[PDB]
Amino acid sequence: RETESWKLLESSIIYYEGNPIGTVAAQDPELAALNYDQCFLRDFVPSAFVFLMDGQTDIVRNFLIETLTLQSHEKEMDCFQPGAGLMPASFKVESDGSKEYLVADFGEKAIARVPPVDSCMWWILLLRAYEKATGDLTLAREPKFQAGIKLILDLCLAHRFSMYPTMLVPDGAFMIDRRMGVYEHPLEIQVLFYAALRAARELLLPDGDGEQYLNKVHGRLGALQYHIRNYYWVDLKRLREIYRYKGNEFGKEIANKFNIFSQSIPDWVIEWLPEKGGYLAGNLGPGRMDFRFFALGNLMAILAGLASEEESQRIMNLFAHRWEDLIGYMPVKICYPALQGLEWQIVTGCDPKNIPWSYHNGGNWPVLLWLFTAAALKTGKVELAHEAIAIAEGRLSNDKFPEYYDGNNGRLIGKEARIYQTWSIAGLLVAKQFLANPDHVEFISFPDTFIGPGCSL
Amino acid sequence: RETESWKLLESSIIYYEGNPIGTVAAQDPELAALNYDQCFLRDFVPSAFVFLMDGQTDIVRNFLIETLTLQSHEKEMDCFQPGAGLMPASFKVESDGSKEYLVADFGEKAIARVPPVDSCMWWILLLRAYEKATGDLTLAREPKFQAGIKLILDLCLAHRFSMYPTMLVPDGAFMIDRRMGVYEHPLEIQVLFYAALRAARELLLPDGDGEQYLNKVHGRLGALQYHIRNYYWVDLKRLREIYRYKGNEFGKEIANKFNIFSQSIPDWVIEWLPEKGGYLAGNLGPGRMDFRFFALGNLMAILAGLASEEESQRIMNLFAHRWEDLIGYMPVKICYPALQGLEWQIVTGCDPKNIPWSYHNGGNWPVLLWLFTAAALKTGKVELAHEAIAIAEGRLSNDKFPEYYDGNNGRLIGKEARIYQTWSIAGLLVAKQFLANPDHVEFISFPDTFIGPGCSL
Amino acid sequence: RETESWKLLESSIIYYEGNPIGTVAAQDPELAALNYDQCFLRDFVPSAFVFLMDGQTDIVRNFLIETLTLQSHEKEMDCFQPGAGLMPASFKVESDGSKEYLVADFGEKAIARVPPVDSCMWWILLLRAYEKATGDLTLAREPKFQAGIKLILDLCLAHRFSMYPTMLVPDGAFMIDRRMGVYEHPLEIQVLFYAALRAARELLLPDGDGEQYLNKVHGRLGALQYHIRNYYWVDLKRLREIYRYKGNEFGKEIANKFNIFSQSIPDWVIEWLPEKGGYLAGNLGPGRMDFRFFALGNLMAILAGLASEEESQRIMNLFAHRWEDLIGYMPVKICYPALQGLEWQIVTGCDPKNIPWSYHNGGNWPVLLWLFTAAALKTGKVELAHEAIAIAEGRLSNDKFPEYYDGNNGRLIGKEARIYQTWSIAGLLVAKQFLANPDHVEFISFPDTFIGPGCSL
């Protein structure tokens, strides 16, 4: 098309052996490209959607094929290898004088050696998205694709010492790829885990051990939805219960299973919730409940069908009631609130890129707009999608599509934000296209809600 | 006239050799006179305007004469003598049994030995105000008066080690005559400096060396105006620039010339600014930008013609938007916001007179109403002038014209505030007289703005 | 000589048109040279000393000549011009394809545009030192060198508003060249000022205007010495007096002239002082007394003859008693104590280079060894000189002569310290040569004391 956004997206494309295989993170002129000249798997997802909806589906097919190939690459740090299923954080095309080849990062080159746990889950979801948008059922069912999914599921469904059906991760294992107190069981990983499992339920063949994987996938989905809906869910009713929990309860039939001390609960949470509002908490673990609202996990939980229809409503009500906090001058705030003062020091380790209301620490991210629009249509709240898109559209082009925005409400352009960030551009585009045709939402969302009050099914 | 204020103003007058030479700072019966029995040069400025607009020009003339003589006095502290162009802070009439004589304080008697830098600049502006109100051009031209102006310009245009066109001062060198972190290059000094130059530009005779002075003045004005307007000016656009600045930039052609670190931008300012608001920062120095709003300098910027017409508008826009912060229960707040807790300790040296939201540290000062009125009229916003005067007339008389008011909104009478403070009284009168005849503003302001987009002219 | 240090110093030499004119600040292989490839005037002083004591004096003669040429350079920022006497911070040799020329920085390129006020003062002291070292009395007495001295004196003795005979400067005006709360009247500037006046008194020719300067100089010196010694001097007796000062005292005949509130005296200083110890305060200003111990200013005050025989002993007594703090693992701690927590934030503007116990904020500086050794010799405390060198010798070569050390006791190598820092190397060399031959101290010191118990003489 003729729009500026379309053109930038066009010039972001990375070509391999004459074929388009992905998009760069950003096209910032002044700043050295550094790591951002690479194609990040998570960053590509919204790029892919734009292409899938525009009809040109080769680039997405190529990407899916090369990333599956990259899974096979030898990946080692100090003679230690991770599970074979691991997908990379990013990749770029490098060439010696003669020929071209793909160089990836699986965390071994990454800053703080963060592991891209979310990438393999996005890869599975992006595969489904390709399948539903195009109708091509052959690709996912090719042997190499079936094998790779099972490798991913082998990792995801690996055994634990723990009684939690959730996935244990170190800090910075997802979109937040720096130290932000999102270690242990962050919502985002658990929601993408659930969704990637729901995806696998569709894409997998019962042939061979296929029969066995679907049985594991199925059992884990039941436990995961139950665990997440029962223990992560926050609203006034639930908040009143927790507040009155007694400490140091021992046994099976007890209320305060995770030994959350009520005095630990922050003061801001009680005021913040509207009567009808609610959300899924950012984390849960031994003696820990992270009450910070995380946007992606909560929005995606609606789309994945993990949130009940009412829970989905109560999330959007909170968005309506705390519009200046969650959207403000630029949708969407990555999480709320920011860690401030000494809490910033301890939890981030004095990370100067995640100072309060900046970047991961409560910054405002354009890319999340597509999650937000998709979740709003699905909940029958288009007015909110219109307002969000209007707000973003009013600034991005003028501000050259910054990577992120800072401050309580997003007034500031991100402190170290790259300009011409691809998923900021693609974010707007994807949101407008969902707005134009709300049936496109179907490839990233699930028609039914696959949940229950029981731990099984 | 029969108004209560006129009578108090008239009883405030100081007589010398049977002649009216000035007005006392305050007439507090209960409090010890201390130094408030003296006549301060800056406190007299608003008193003078009352008289000028009424036609009683003798007292102003006499003041201007006696102060010019006072300049030529021998002032010394520990065998050190300052520039001979130094005007005193205050003077009183002392008499031995036999005869009357004039004793002055140039800072050698002052608390903390603070230098009255603003005083010599006020005298000039007052001198110009005498002309424009009266039409008498003989007093400015006199040999002594032209010499005194020159002596002042010798000081202000003294050579520096610094590359800043601004004036360097110690702490507490103007209306704020105490340690308030207004050391170095404070807005008030720079604005009064700029304004005194424009006045001198008109009052100077080209005869003799006058031409040499005229060109220096003309040169400095162009450099100064460029410096203030480009580096002190704050609005949202500018704030987004600074927040994204890079540290430790080196060389002639760089963005962050003064090495401001964005993490040091206080939290309050970004929410505080309205979309169309703006103001001049309180100070600028090496690695330092004081984002506190200072009223006098900002309002006097409008009057002096330093602020452009649009910039003037953005200052007045701020007042409407932050009316409760900047006016509240008593116009006008001297600066916003207050230094609090540990910041108050460090910056003021635990000064108990300046505790948070008191006195210089965010107090509300009745006198500043005349600045505010003059600028409101000049900017074509009479309604704001009206409301400010009403708020003041609502309390002043009943409160017995306190020197200042305290609190976030000036709800309290100043902790150690004098009652029957003369420039609170004169401040209200001048404002009302301005309101009756807006043309009177012209003798404290400049109709034209002497500025451009470069350092020359 | 054949020592490792002598060769590192040789490599550092900068050649202009086939002549040695100065030395680079550091020779770090890994770091980009940046501003350090230039020759800083202050950094060269110890380098110059090594060459004076070696016998090769032409580099120093050349340096004095080329820097005097620089003084004549046209220097401006935004159409504004400082005094002609301003000496630059640093200079470097630059070439076209075929021509060599000198490019200096007078502050217009400097980080935070800080003014090298100390540079012009060092220039004078060095010239005297050169003269005393060689015997060449033609150089200083040349008509260009008499003019340049006069231009510096013109700036330094410029007229003030203040009643303080000290020199008023912005923050970062000396060796500490960043925002560190050393604005106003920092000890170092006043001590270097005193020292530079004494040098001019020796250097200046009486014929022509020379006599006029000598009289201004003489009178200033008398005032300055009285001012510093009476108001900056800290000991237990003085502290007890100030602690009992009354606030807000007004007039000429008062104890608390500067309005120091006792509650603002830090807790650390009372315990820190030994009974017979004493030192000069870091700063004096309205309502302000900086009690931080500053090393250079205090050590140099001994050499310059500003400090009395007893004051000098008490200063060295303090060093002896607080050896762990002031010397620790690397002489000498640049100032004590470090600003911490919120005080670091406010005072430095969150400057990440001057975090607590790092760099200017209480770092340990090897270059100060030459000051300390020279002073310990002069005071008859050679044992202290031996010990300081011993400690320094123990690590400098192994650590590759870092720029500075960090920590409470300098245990850490400076966070962003350059290796092969020229004046760290020269620092150790100068100290050793002084030890080997103490009579050399005479060229950077004054044999006589020029201090009076009265303001005059």
| 3-state secondary structure labels for all residues of chain A | CCCHHHHHHHHCEEEECCEEEEECCECCCCCCCCCCCCEEHHHHHHHHHHHHHHCCCHHHHHHHHHHHHHHCCCCCECCECCCCCCCCCEEEEEECCCCEEEEEECCCCCHHHCCCHHHHHHHHHHHHHHHHHHCCCCCCCCHHHHHHHHHHHHHHCCCCCCCCCCCCECCCCCCCCCCCCCCECEHHHHHHHHHHHHHHHHHCCCCCCHHHHHHHHHHHHHHHHHHHHHHCEECHHHHHHHHCCCCCCCCCCCCCCCCCCHHHCCCHHHHHCCCCCCEEEEEEECCEEEEEEEHHHHHHHHHCCCCCHHHHHHHHHHHHHCHHHHCCCCCCECEECCCCCHHHHHHHCCCCCCCCCECCECCECHHHHHHHHHHHHHCCCHHHHHHHHHHHHCCCCCCCCCCCEECCCCCEECCCCCCCEHHHHHHHHHHHHHHHCCCHHHHCCCCCCCCCCCCCC
Q: Which of A184, A74, A196 is nearest to A128 (CA)?
A: A196
What are the distances in angstroms from CA C173 to CA A97, A296, B363? Answer: 53, 50, 33
Backbone torsions φ then ψ of C398, nearest 5 degrees:
-65, -35
CA terminus-to-terminus distance, chain A: 45
DSSP state of B12: T
Question: Are A119 and A88 spatial neighbours (Cβ–Cβ below 8 Å)?
Answer: yes
Residue B280's SS3 state is strand
Binding-site sequence positions of C: 35, 111, 177-178, 359
Chain C contact set for B219 (CB, 8 A):
79
Chain B contact set for A409 (CB, 8 A):
271
Q: Determine the angle formed by the axes of helices A295-303 and A369-378, rounding to 10 degrees.
A: 40
Distance CA C235, CA C293 (A): 12
Give me the long-range contacts of A24-29 (CB less than 8 A, separation at least 24).
Answer: A24/A422, A25/A90, A25/A418, A25/A421, A25/A422, A25/A423, A26/A403, A26/A418, A26/A419, A26/A420, A26/A421, A26/A422, A27/A420, A27/A422, A28/A418, A28/A419, A28/A420, A28/A421, A29/A419, A29/A420
Q: Which of A120, A111, A112 is nearest to A82 (CA)?
A: A120
Question: Are C454 and C396 spatial neighbours (Cβ–Cβ below 8 Å)?
Answer: no
With an 8 Å Cβ cutoff, are A412 and B271 in contact?
no
Opening angle at CA A362, ends C344 and A245, nearest 5: 100
Of B162, B251, B350, the CB nearest to C170: B162
Residues belonging to chain B: 457
DSSP state of B150: H
Q: How far is CA A290 from the centre of its chain?
A: 18
Q: How distant is the Cα of A416 from the closest Cα of chain B, in angstroms?
A: 7
Chain B contact set for C112 (CB, 8 A):
257-259, 286-287
Residues belonging to chain A: 457
Neighbouring chains of A at 3+ CB pairs within 8 Å? B
Q: Which of C143, C80, C145, C150 is nearest to C115 (CA)?
A: C80
DSSP state of B90: E
Q: Write out the two tokens for A29.
A: 């002129």
- Judged by a CB distance cut-off of 8 A, whether residue B242 touches chain A is no
- Judged by a CB distance cut-off of 8 A, whether residue B157 touches chain C is no
Q: 3-class secondary structure for chain C? A: CCCHHHHHHHHHEEECCCCEEEECCECCCCCCCHHHHCEEHHHHHHHHHHHHHHCCCHHHHHHHHHHHHHHCCCCCECCECCCCCCCCCEEEEEECCCCEEEEEECCCCCHHHCCCHHHHHHHHHHHHHHHHHHCCCHHHHCHHHHHHHHHHHHHHCCCCCCCCCCCCECCCCCCCCCCCCCCECEHHHHHHHHHHHHHHHHHCCCCCCHHHHHHHHHHHHHHHHHHHHHHCEECHHHHHHHHCCCCCCCCCCCCCCCCCCHHHCCCHHHHHCCCCCCEEEEEEECCEEEEEEEHHHHHHHHHHCCCCHHHHHHHHHHHHHCHHHHCCCCCCECEECCCCHHHHHHHHCCCHHHCCCECCECCECHHHHHHHHHHHHHCCCHHHHHHHHHHHHHHCCCCCCCCCEECCCCCEECCCCCCCEHHHHHHHHHHHHHHHCHHHHHHCCCCCCCCCCCCCC
**Sheet of C90-95: strands edge to edge?**
C39-40, C90-95, C100-105
Distance CA C85, CA A120 (A): 68
Which amino acid is located at B345 in the chain? Q
Q: Would the annotation count B111 as a binding residue?
A: yes
Backbone torsions φ then ψ of A90, nearest 5 degrees:
-155, 175
DSSP bridge partners of B80: B77
Question: Are A45 and A122 spatial neighbours (Cβ–Cβ below 8 Å)?
Answer: yes
With an 8 Å Cβ cutoff, are A408 and B270 in contact?
yes
Backbone torsions φ then ψ of C81, nearest 5 degrees:
-125, 125
Residue B396's SS3 state is helix
Placement of tokens 């080159």 in the chain: A109
Which amino acid is located at C63 in the chain? F
Q: How distant is the Cα of C6 from the closest Cα of chain B, in angstroms?
A: 31
Question: After which residues does chain A show a gap where C to N exceeds 2.5 Å?
Answer: none
Chain B contact set for C222 (CB, 8 A):
79
- Judged by a CB distance cut-off of 8 A, whether residue C251 touches chain B is yes
Task: Identify how the structure was determined.
Answer: X-ray
**Sheet of A90-95: strands edge to edge?**
A39-40, A90-95, A100-105
Beta-carbon count within 10 A of B144 CB: 13
Q: Write out the two tokens for B443.
A: 């003798």
Question: Are A12 and A32 spatial neighbours (Cβ–Cβ below 8 Å)?
Answer: no
Q: Write out the two tokens for A158.
A: 């690996």
- Judged by a CB distance cut-off of 8 A, whether residue A306 touches chain B is no
| Non-local CB neighbours of C311 within 8 Å, separated by 6+ positions | C229, C233, C278, C301
Placement of tokens 């029981």 in the chain: A454
Phi-psi region of B310 (alpha: psi -120 to 50; beta: other; left: phi over 0): alpha
| Non-local CB neighbours of B226 within 8 Å, separated by 6+ positions | B165, B451, B452, B454, B455, C78, C79
With an 8 Å Cβ cutoff, are B262 and A408 in contact?
no
Distance CA A173, CA C212 (A): 75
Residues 372 through 431 of chain C touching chain B, CB cutoff 8 Å: none
Q: What is the largest CA-CA distance in chain B?
A: 69
- Judged by a CB distance cut-off of 8 A, whether residue C360 touches chain B is no
- Judged by a CB distance cut-off of 8 A, whether residue C123 touches chain B is no
Distance CA A93, CA B143 (A): 81
Distance CA C212, CA C121 (A): 20
- Judged by a CB distance cut-off of 8 A, whether residue B227 touches chain C is yes
Residue B192's SS3 state is helix
Per-residue burial over B284-320, b = 16 or more CB atoms within 10 Å of its CB, e = otherwise: bbbbbbbbbbbbbbbbbbbbbbbbbeebbbbbbbbbb
Of B110, B164, B346, the CB nearest to C346: B346
With an 8 Å Cβ cutoff, are B287 and C257 in contact?
no
Chain B contact set for C227 (CB, 8 A):
78, 80
What are the distances in angstroms from CA B404 to CA B356, B409, B419? Answer: 14, 12, 9
Which amino acid is located at C128 in the chain? R
Q: Which of A28, A20, A23 is nearest to A12 (CA)?
A: A23
Q: Kindly give the residue spans of alpha helices, DSSP state H, lying in B93-246.
A: 117-134, 138-141, 143-156, 187-203, 210-227, 236-243
Q: Determine the angle formed by the axes of helices C309-321 and C382-395, rounding to 10 degrees.
A: 40
Question: Are C191 and C365 spatial neighbours (Cβ–Cβ below 8 Å)?
Answer: no
